[PDB]
């Protein structure tokens, strides 16, 4: 909440689902990209944003994997 | 006459050279000159030694490279 | 010992030759000169390993179907060279096997997992290679690929109709620099790069300065090439613009010496170490852009005199 998650019981449940279990990659859908910033406040400097449409996608993710970078991929539709 | 390969110099075969001269055993040399590196690369791998290398000794189907395997051979050829 | 005098002496000869390799490693491992020596070692290594790959054709272990002593010698060597290089085996599957085979022997495998096993270091703790308390991991391996690429940097150079020599095909190095720079930024996210941290900061400052001169240099190269079409060839054009051609040729001298000094270096990275390069190019591009801008004002003032010229272009 302190980052800026919404008070809603729905949105708390959702966040709990995303965080609590990570044996699998979570897919976030939100029209208002207020959630993209929530996870950014949680992981801070380590937060690296990419998108499956961008040019250097190919390489930048290889750099993200190698050094423990917490990654959010901006266009999940395109994969 | 057995065949000893090394640079035209004392290098890693010197002791062996002495031993040979000690046992008054005759031999012939494959000598690498100062700027003769080609000549080496020319024979380097087509010699059929157990490990190609320098120096090398070759006699009665005794192919030796590794200064130790070589020296021991000369030594053994005189029961030593 | 083996089957017979011959096979027993053969097993001893293997002992010897294996040590001539295991030892070769440790003699350049205490040296401060390690980081650059490995290159020439790993290149020779193949020829030595090869002999063993052959021996291992139609044999289950070195020297036959039963495990022999030389197999345990080569295994020590192997075990040690794989820590230095993880891909020492990759090019020789028959050895990758021999290695796993040893590790597979129930007794051995049970041992490596036991309390009796001393797992690491490889060489006396003082040694440069494989010493110290705990093995580091990838950060160095990647930084080495970055440094390697930059002490090979090669630019298509082609001299055109007149004096100066041109740098063609910008993109490849253009891209590489920016990518390898983004790589160092992501290295800050890693846990164990704090003290190894400092060196990378030096290589980061070296490449961030290479992109500083990369940005301006492509601009210079483009805007000179463009202006050469316009003023470099005719007498009529330079007749109308005298202050412009007298100032173009003065820059043409400087950049001709700047390129030929930078080309003969043979290392594009080495260019950041050259005296007054970012300052020289920033001066050159400024003046080249003042000429382009002067021509622009001349052509439009020509067009306003006879407003048909607006139609022409």
mmCIF file of N, CA, C and O in Angstrom, chain A residues 45-46 48 55-56 58-60 63-64 66-70, chain C residues 138-139 141-142 145 175 179 182-183 186-191:
data_model
loop_
_atom_site.group_PDB
_atom_site.id
_atom_site.type_symbol
_atom_site.label_atom_id
_atom_site.label_comp_id
_atom_site.label_asym_id
_atom_site.label_seq_id
_atom_site.Cartn_x
_atom_site.Cartn_y
_atom_site.Cartn_z
ATOM 1 N N UNK A 45 16.282 0.151 -7.445
ATOM 2 C CA UNK A 45 17.374 0.235 -8.432
ATOM 3 C C UNK A 45 17.421 -0.997 -9.322
ATOM 4 O O UNK A 45 17.687 -0.914 -10.526
ATOM 5 N N UNK A 46 17.167 -2.144 -8.697
ATOM 6 C CA UNK A 46 17.175 -3.443 -9.349
ATOM 7 C C UNK A 46 16.081 -3.572 -10.434
ATOM 8 O O UNK A 46 16.144 -4.466 -11.274
ATOM 9 N N UNK A 48 14.358 -3.190 -13.697
ATOM 10 C CA UNK A 48 14.692 -2.922 -15.095
ATOM 11 C C UNK A 48 13.466 -3.213 -15.961
ATOM 12 O O UNK A 48 12.959 -4.325 -15.947
ATOM 13 N N UNK A 55 13.795 -2.692 -29.721
ATOM 14 C CA UNK A 55 14.882 -3.164 -30.592
ATOM 15 C C UNK A 55 15.880 -4.083 -29.848
ATOM 16 O O UNK A 55 16.185 -5.223 -30.262
ATOM 17 N N UNK A 56 16.395 -3.569 -28.737
ATOM 18 C CA UNK A 56 17.502 -4.203 -28.031
ATOM 19 C C UNK A 56 17.021 -5.240 -27.048
ATOM 20 O O UNK A 56 17.790 -5.647 -26.134
ATOM 21 N N UNK A 58 16.365 -8.370 -27.279
ATOM 22 C CA UNK A 58 17.183 -9.564 -27.475
ATOM 23 C C UNK A 58 18.377 -9.636 -26.492
ATOM 24 O O UNK A 58 18.595 -10.674 -25.837
ATOM 25 N N UNK A 59 19.095 -8.518 -26.355
ATOM 26 C CA UNK A 59 20.325 -8.427 -25.582
ATOM 27 C C UNK A 59 20.090 -8.006 -24.152
ATOM 28 O O UNK A 59 20.721 -8.523 -23.224
ATOM 29 N N UNK A 60 19.169 -7.067 -23.991
ATOM 30 C CA UNK A 60 18.949 -6.427 -22.716
ATOM 31 C C UNK A 60 18.424 -7.412 -21.664
ATOM 32 O O UNK A 60 18.650 -7.238 -20.455
ATOM 33 N N UNK A 63 21.275 -9.491 -20.228
ATOM 34 C CA UNK A 63 21.994 -8.716 -19.221
ATOM 35 C C UNK A 63 21.237 -8.700 -17.912
ATOM 36 O O UNK A 63 21.814 -8.611 -16.825
ATOM 37 N N UNK A 64 19.921 -8.752 -18.045
ATOM 38 C CA UNK A 64 19.015 -8.731 -16.922
ATOM 39 C C UNK A 64 19.051 -10.062 -16.176
ATOM 40 O O UNK A 64 18.990 -10.103 -14.944
ATOM 41 N N UNK A 66 21.633 -12.253 -16.212
ATOM 42 C CA UNK A 66 22.959 -12.551 -15.722
ATOM 43 C C UNK A 66 23.270 -11.941 -14.363
ATOM 44 O O UNK A 66 24.001 -12.525 -13.571
ATOM 45 N N UNK A 67 22.700 -10.771 -14.090
ATOM 46 C CA UNK A 67 23.036 -10.064 -12.867
ATOM 47 C C UNK A 67 21.836 -9.766 -11.975
ATOM 48 O O UNK A 67 21.734 -8.686 -11.410
ATOM 49 N N UNK A 68 20.931 -10.734 -11.859
ATOM 50 C CA UNK A 68 19.877 -10.722 -10.843
ATOM 51 C C UNK A 68 18.844 -9.628 -10.927
ATOM 52 O O UNK A 68 18.131 -9.392 -9.954
ATOM 53 N N UNK A 69 18.764 -8.973 -12.086
ATOM 54 C CA UNK A 69 17.861 -7.847 -12.305
ATOM 55 C C UNK A 69 16.414 -8.312 -12.282
ATOM 56 O O UNK A 69 16.064 -9.308 -12.892
ATOM 57 N N UNK A 70 15.579 -7.571 -11.569
ATOM 58 C CA UNK A 70 14.161 -7.859 -11.497
ATOM 59 C C UNK A 70 13.511 -7.180 -12.701
ATOM 60 O O UNK A 70 13.592 -5.942 -12.883
ATOM 61 N N UNK C 138 30.638 -14.847 -13.118
ATOM 62 C CA UNK C 138 30.405 -14.581 -14.536
ATOM 63 C C UNK C 138 30.920 -13.192 -14.907
ATOM 64 O O UNK C 138 31.398 -12.985 -16.017
ATOM 65 N N UNK C 139 30.822 -12.254 -13.965
ATOM 66 C CA UNK C 139 31.183 -10.843 -14.166
ATOM 67 C C UNK C 139 32.535 -10.659 -14.861
ATOM 68 O O UNK C 139 32.671 -9.838 -15.783
ATOM 69 N N UNK C 141 34.204 -13.177 -16.591
ATOM 70 C CA UNK C 141 34.092 -13.851 -17.890
ATOM 71 C C UNK C 141 33.458 -12.963 -18.994
ATOM 72 O O UNK C 141 33.840 -13.021 -20.171
ATOM 73 N N UNK C 142 32.497 -12.133 -18.604
ATOM 74 C CA UNK C 142 31.836 -11.224 -19.540
ATOM 75 C C UNK C 142 32.690 -9.982 -19.844
ATOM 76 O O UNK C 142 32.836 -9.599 -21.011
ATOM 77 N N UNK C 145 35.273 -10.692 -22.318
ATOM 78 C CA UNK C 145 34.741 -10.666 -23.695
ATOM 79 C C UNK C 145 34.566 -9.250 -24.228
ATOM 80 O O UNK C 145 34.625 -9.008 -25.444
ATOM 81 N N UNK C 175 26.878 0.051 -32.475
ATOM 82 C CA UNK C 175 25.933 -0.732 -31.700
ATOM 83 C C UNK C 175 26.627 -1.404 -30.521
ATOM 84 O O UNK C 175 26.170 -1.300 -29.366
ATOM 85 N N UNK C 179 25.816 -1.313 -26.476
ATOM 86 C CA UNK C 179 25.425 -2.588 -25.857
ATOM 87 C C UNK C 179 26.346 -2.999 -24.706
ATOM 88 O O UNK C 179 25.877 -3.347 -23.615
ATOM 89 N N UNK C 182 25.803 -0.787 -21.764
ATOM 90 C CA UNK C 182 24.587 -1.157 -21.049
ATOM 91 C C UNK C 182 24.813 -2.400 -20.196
ATOM 92 O O UNK C 182 24.156 -2.590 -19.168
ATOM 93 N N UNK C 183 25.739 -3.243 -20.648
ATOM 94 C CA UNK C 183 26.130 -4.463 -19.944
ATOM 95 C C UNK C 183 26.799 -4.138 -18.597
ATOM 96 O O UNK C 183 26.493 -4.770 -17.584
ATOM 97 N N UNK C 186 24.311 -2.958 -15.987
ATOM 98 C CA UNK C 186 23.593 -4.098 -15.400
ATOM 99 C C UNK C 186 24.466 -4.937 -14.465
ATOM 100 O O UNK C 186 23.954 -5.726 -13.666
ATOM 101 N N UNK C 187 25.781 -4.733 -14.549
ATOM 102 C CA UNK C 187 26.734 -5.406 -13.665
ATOM 103 C C UNK C 187 26.708 -4.848 -12.253
ATOM 104 O O UNK C 187 27.169 -5.496 -11.316
ATOM 105 N N UNK C 188 26.172 -3.639 -12.120
ATOM 106 C CA UNK C 188 25.993 -2.985 -10.829
ATOM 107 C C UNK C 188 24.910 -3.669 -9.996
ATOM 108 O O UNK C 188 24.932 -3.625 -8.763
ATOM 109 N N UNK C 189 23.988 -4.336 -10.679
ATOM 110 C CA UNK C 189 22.926 -5.082 -10.018
ATOM 111 C C UNK C 189 23.429 -6.360 -9.341
ATOM 112 O O UNK C 189 22.804 -6.842 -8.395
ATOM 113 N N UNK C 190 24.556 -6.892 -9.817
ATOM 114 C CA UNK C 190 25.156 -8.101 -9.242
ATOM 115 C C UNK C 190 25.692 -7.897 -7.826
ATOM 116 O O UNK C 190 26.169 -6.806 -7.471
ATOM 117 N N UNK C 191 25.611 -8.975 -7.045
ATOM 118 C CA UNK C 191 26.010 -9.007 -5.643
ATOM 119 C C UNK C 191 27.513 -8.934 -5.389
ATOM 120 O O UNK C 191 27.955 -8.240 -4.465
#
